Ligand binder design. Sequence first.
Ligand code: MG
Ligand code: MG
Lengths: 388, 388
Amino acid sequence: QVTVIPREQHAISRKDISENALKVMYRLNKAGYEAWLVGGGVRDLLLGKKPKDFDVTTNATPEQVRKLFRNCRLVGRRFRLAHVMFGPEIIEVATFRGNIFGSIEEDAQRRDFTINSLYYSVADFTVRDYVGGMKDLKDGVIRLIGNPETRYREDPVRMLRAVRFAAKLGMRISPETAEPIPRLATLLNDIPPAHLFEESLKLLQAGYGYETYKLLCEYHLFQPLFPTITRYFTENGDSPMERIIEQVLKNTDTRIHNDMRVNPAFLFAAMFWYPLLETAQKIAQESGLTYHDAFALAMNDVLDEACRSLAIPKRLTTLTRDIWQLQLRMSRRQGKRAWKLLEHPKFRAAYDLLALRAEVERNAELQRLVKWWGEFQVSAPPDQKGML
Amino acid sequence: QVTVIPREQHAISRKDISENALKVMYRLNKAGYEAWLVGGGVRDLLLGKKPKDFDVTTNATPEQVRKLFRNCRLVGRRFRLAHVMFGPEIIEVATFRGNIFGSIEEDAQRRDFTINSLYYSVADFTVRDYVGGMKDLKDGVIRLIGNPETRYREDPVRMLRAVRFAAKLGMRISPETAEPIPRLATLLNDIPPAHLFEESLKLLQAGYGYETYKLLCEYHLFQPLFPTITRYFTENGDSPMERIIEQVLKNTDTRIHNDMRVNPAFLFAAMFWYPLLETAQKIAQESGLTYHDAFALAMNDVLDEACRSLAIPKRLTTLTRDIWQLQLRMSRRQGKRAWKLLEHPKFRAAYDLLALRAEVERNAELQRLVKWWGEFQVSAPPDQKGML
Ligand SMILES: [Mg+2]
Ligand SMILES: [Mg+2]
């Protein structure tokens, strides 16, 4: 058991890679308080990689953190936890917890996993490890902190997080941490769908999506979130839907690493596609009506019951409705309206779906439509005219 | 002589082809004033096409108009002319003019051209013609009202208008109205660059551009507006600049006849391109700087001289510079920095310009970066990955 690591034993964590929340700590340190660097950032630093956040903690009460910074720009609210602003770097300043506000050792125990629970002191260049930490981090192990059994019951979402970190760093989940998930997964249904929607994005949409879906599938965590989707999985292994989902995820992933921006309205529009299509089949051959009005129904429903687990915001659903709408429109080869279409704000997305639709089905009459719209959109107006 | 023409014998501008700004004439009629439809609208109606506006004129004081329409959504300001709103519809309601104002006939005289000064009443279905009006309409003639010489001096923009209508409608400028133009052309230099900008757009961007240019050139009206460009014309008639200024105008025109949003800042960035290219190279030898630094100066230069005639908005000058800059970036066979580029807001315009640049110079080198970028921009991240 090693509770304090000296800077000369702990990987660089060189004071010079800490941007300047340094100013935020030195200020506290000057005032008879303690300033520690917790969680995400301090993990990464030890890891070698570049911190994306810098969060700090202190034995200073939240009203004591208030006075010391009444002159600075403090962004809003939140019990405990204060928000400091430079600009394109905001710094989180949280008071230790335990009756309510306690010690560093106390605070370490209410933190979900090991590595995300290392602490750094500018004041002593030491990192504090009241937990597995340093070893877990070295061995590459996502270990939970209290008794898995009970923690997952208090906050089930911890279970999702477990996988998420599992995929983003190349690490494995501790056996005792792993055992309970498949049994307890269903517990995510007692979760406010909104909260789930956030974690759906943190999982797929943060550029690890593919590896995180593999892990979400291997622990039956995928199913409580996307029941409309699980249902159309197949024994064989790789139907058209099961291919698209992999692909859109690998791509959504590639875009993030090349630093593109990305549409979440898209990722859903892709994944629920084939289900929408299936529901269009049954809706038409049964209860016989036109394919158009049928399809329209399939949307409301697919989206209704999906929106029953994740709470997709009215905004995204409505763009999705459009990316699907375009799928039909683009299908019928025709003229004049084409300009009207190319103009559509969600066109770029709609094209990228048709892209997938044709890659996965390997249906060459789509890949046909795909070359046509490919050329119609990079082509200049005299030739655009000639294509109709 | 032939001053009042009845519903049957006029190309029945049928009461049914008036947008319910009929509701606004009615309140005026019902209330004891008369109310007539003028110009823009009544001209297109008699011609058959769908009007783009409906302006009504009345003999109510601007003060009496203000009172009668209190219950209404009347958008403010501007002596005389009064404005009324509905949905996507605004209805211009101006008093007649003449101490200041008086009889319908007194008004017809301060209007610039014949055809735009026909009057229609829904109260009688008669159109009043107190000028060549009807006959000129039939004959296909833009004819100034009073004494050309005097009027063009009173307002030089009447000159541009004349050439604009000439081009948009398909008709000839009457002799007595054409003679003074080439002489008085310069007169435009005495006018705020603001106005010249406004009108510069009604001429080239309204989707008649090309024809309106063939005219602006044939009347030495082009030069006062684009000193910088005129200077670069060539007797041959086939320099790459001249080709481009034609093409871009044609293309802009096509865009407008297929209801596309058109970019103002593109147009300019296309015309001045070659003057920018030229002023650049001259700065390159005349004063041995790197080409990259040279260029940015040349941008500054080309822009102030043009700003010296047209009051181009700081808004649109930023966009233009950006479109041009991208022209260097896209030339370097850039690697992974490309993703960032693909993302630029302006990239579509930059691309559309590299587009032309290849088409007019009939260069193969460039024609390649066009085929390349054409693909990289529609490909999927797998494919796209590869290309780099
Ligand atoms: Mg944070
Ligand atoms: Mg008007």
